[PDB]
Design a protein around this ligand. Structure first.
Ligand SMILES: *[C@@H]1O[C@H](CO[C@@H]2O[C@@H](C)[C@@H](O)[C@@H](O)[C@@H]2O)[C@@H](O)[C@H](O[C@@H]2O[C@@H](C)[C@@H](O)[C@@H](O)[C@@H]2O)[C@H]1NC(C)=O
Ligand SMILES: *[C@@H]1O[C@H](CO[C@@H]2O[C@@H](C)[C@@H](O)[C@@H](O)[C@@H]2O)[C@@H](O)[C@H](O)[C@H]1NC(C)=O
Lengths: 193, 201, 141
């Protein structure tokens, strides 16, 4: 028999759904893999006898509950399947939003941009799919470890009343106001007051 | 002799429009009929029967923003036969565009204040009074921008009706634009745009 | 015990794809005289039973029009059908504490009208997915 794929995972961020596996411990470098998804009663081939260690599942519906499986194969004999359960809008990772800061004077003006989703040939953002999308802002200076937080549902925010001539560094993340779902933080972008 | 027969709907003001053709006689007249989708009888609008103009206000006749309707225009030509073309299924809630918000810009010495006033609409509540846009779309909000030069803009957004851009230099020209957004139905008004100048202090 | 959250109807994406799907089907539907999800559907259904009525119409539309009919009206059909299915499963926990002689007769009279119109009946229901979406909203929240 053939050993099945190892460390199989669906790497999904911003609805970029990629099923990833690793080539198994096998001293014979002749090995093909085939990946499938569920279409109602029946499975659909998506990657058929590929040499690659990944398969792109971004064409899947957001609101669809899908189960994905992959096997390594050679000749007529195949491996056991390794299945994962997967629903994009519930399970994908919320990428970090983009932010620009325009500090005029004793103020910090923020502007946000939700991550764009690759499912659609149109400019859709994760904010366009989730009905409860909002931004968490976390701010501090550069000599303190202490933090402060503000939540905003709009693409703009102004941090008002702070000490002047102090460089601040801020980050933003996506989250849902009706879920316990947190998105990934951005890296702090800093602008001087 | 009849073409482009359609609804043009703004803030639930629902106007029927059509155009003549390459055969539009001197005395060519148009009659409008409307009905609610799923009805057999076509109602006749009292005003727009055998009229020479090319539009008809059906606001009172399609007042239910949650309803679906149809309208048709009958063009009769001097030489003969009549042509009747109707519109696509019309839903005011889904097809209406948003008018720019009703704003007064107030120039201040070191800031710019903006007041957005409610707009009444022809759609009524159960008790029979006219609704504001805010009353129809609970998701309505205002996005304001204050443009200085290609590289610098100030932004404010919210559900409130009072906005003030703080921290400006006196005696400076700014461009303010205020936009209504309805995200759920992906509606967006054209911007209201003020050319304002902070007072010279 | 049988209500949907308003949140389920407030996704700009799903609303755009549902309404765009309904418009492409309704443009090919010139039968202005007959309306499926219309007042003939709500005849003699108390308002506390109206969501269960819409529970029956949604699963009807999924099983008899949308599942056999997944082949046309793309790309919207691909995204709307998984959304509508998620709405039927939330509603499996719905059961009327009373007489459903009016709901079953009207949902059956509906299934009869779609089938007496053959294929024209199936496109009409897809052209009425905005009415289904919005009757499901107004009936279950
Ligand atoms: C459905 O979305 C279509 C695409 O618009 C995208 O989504 C918005 C939020 C924004 O990100 C934009 O940049 C994207 O392109 C949109 O075109 C469509 O409108 C319909 O088509 C246009 C051409 C007009 O005819 C309009 O009147 C139509 O309704 C959206 N439709 C609905 C019902 O929301
Ligand atoms: C663009 O404007 C920036 C912002 O400053 C603005 O301009 C001055 C005149 C004052 O009105 C101030 O209150 C405003 O915020 C400038 O910092 C920047 O240098 C300008 N750049 C160019 C290319 O014009």
């Amino acid at each position: 028999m053939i050993p099945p794929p190892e460390k199989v995972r669906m790497n999904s961020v911003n609805f970029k759904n990629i099923l990833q596996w690793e080539v198994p411990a096998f001293p014979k470098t002749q090995l093909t893999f085939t990946a499938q998804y569920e279409s109602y009663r029946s499975f659909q081939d998506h990657c058929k006898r590929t040499a690659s260690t990944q398969c792109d599942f971004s064409h899947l519906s957001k609101y669809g509950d899908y189960t994905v499986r992959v096997r390594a194969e050679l000749a007529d004999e195949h491996s056991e399947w390794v299945q994962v359960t997967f629903c994009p809008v519930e399970d994908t990772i919320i990428g970090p939003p983009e932010m620009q800061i325009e500090s005029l004077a004793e103020s910090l003006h923020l502007r946000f941009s939700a991550p764009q989703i690759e499912n659609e040939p149109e400019t859709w953002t994760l904010k366009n799919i989730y009905d409860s999308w909002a931004y968490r802002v976390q701010y501090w200076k550069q000599g303190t470890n202490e933090k402060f937080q503000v939540v905003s549902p709009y693409d703009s925010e102004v941090l008002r009343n702070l000490e002047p001539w102090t460089t601040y560094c801020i980050q933003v993340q996506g989250f849902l106001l009706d879920q316990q779902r947190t998105g990934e933080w951005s890296e702090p972008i800093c602008e001087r007051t | 002799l009849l073409q482009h027969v359609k609804f043009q709907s703004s803030n639930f003001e629902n106007i029927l429009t059509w155009d003549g053709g390459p055969a539009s006689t001197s005395d060519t007249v148009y009659s409008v009929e409307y009905k609610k989708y799923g009805e057999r009888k076509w109602l006749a609008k009292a005003g727009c029967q055998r009229i020479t103009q090319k539009f008809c206000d059906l606001t009172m006749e399609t007042r239910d923003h949650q309803e679906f309707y149809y309208a048709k225009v009958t063009a009769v030509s001097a030489g003969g036969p009549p042509v009747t073309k109707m519109t696509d299924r019309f839903s005011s809630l889904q097809h209406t565009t948003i008018k720019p918000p009703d704003v007064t810009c107030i120039p201040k010495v070191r800031s710019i204040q903006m007041l957005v006033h409610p707009t009444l609409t022809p759609v009524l509540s159960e008790d029979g009074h006219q609704l504001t846009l805010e009353e129809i779309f609970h998701d309505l909000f205002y996005r304001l921008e204050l443009h200085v030069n290609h590289t610098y803009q100030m932004h404010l957004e919210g559900k409130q009706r009072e906005y003030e851009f703080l921290g400006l230099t006196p005696d400076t020209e700014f461009l303010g634009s205020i936009t209504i957004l309805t995200p759920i139905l992906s509606k967006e008004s054209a911007p209201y745009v003020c050319r304002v100048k902070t007072l010279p202090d | 015990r049988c209500k949907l959250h308003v949140r389920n109807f407030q996704s700009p994406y799903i609303v755009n794809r549902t309404f765009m799907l309904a418009k492409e089907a309704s443009l090919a539907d010139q039968n202005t005289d007959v309306r499926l999800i219309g007042e003939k559907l709500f005849r003699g259904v108390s308002a506390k039973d109206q969501c269960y009525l819409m529970k029956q119409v949604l699963q009807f539309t999924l099983e008899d029009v949308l599942l056999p009919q997944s082949d046309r009206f793309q790309p919207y059909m691909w995204e709307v059908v998984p959304f509508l299915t998620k709405l039927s499963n939330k509603l499996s926990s719905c059961h009327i504490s009373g007489d459903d002689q009016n709901i079953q007769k009207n949902v059956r009279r509906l299934k009869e009208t779609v089938k007496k119109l053959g294929e024209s009946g199936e496109i009409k229901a897809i052209g009425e997915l905005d009415l289904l979406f919005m009757s499901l909203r107004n009936a279950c929240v």
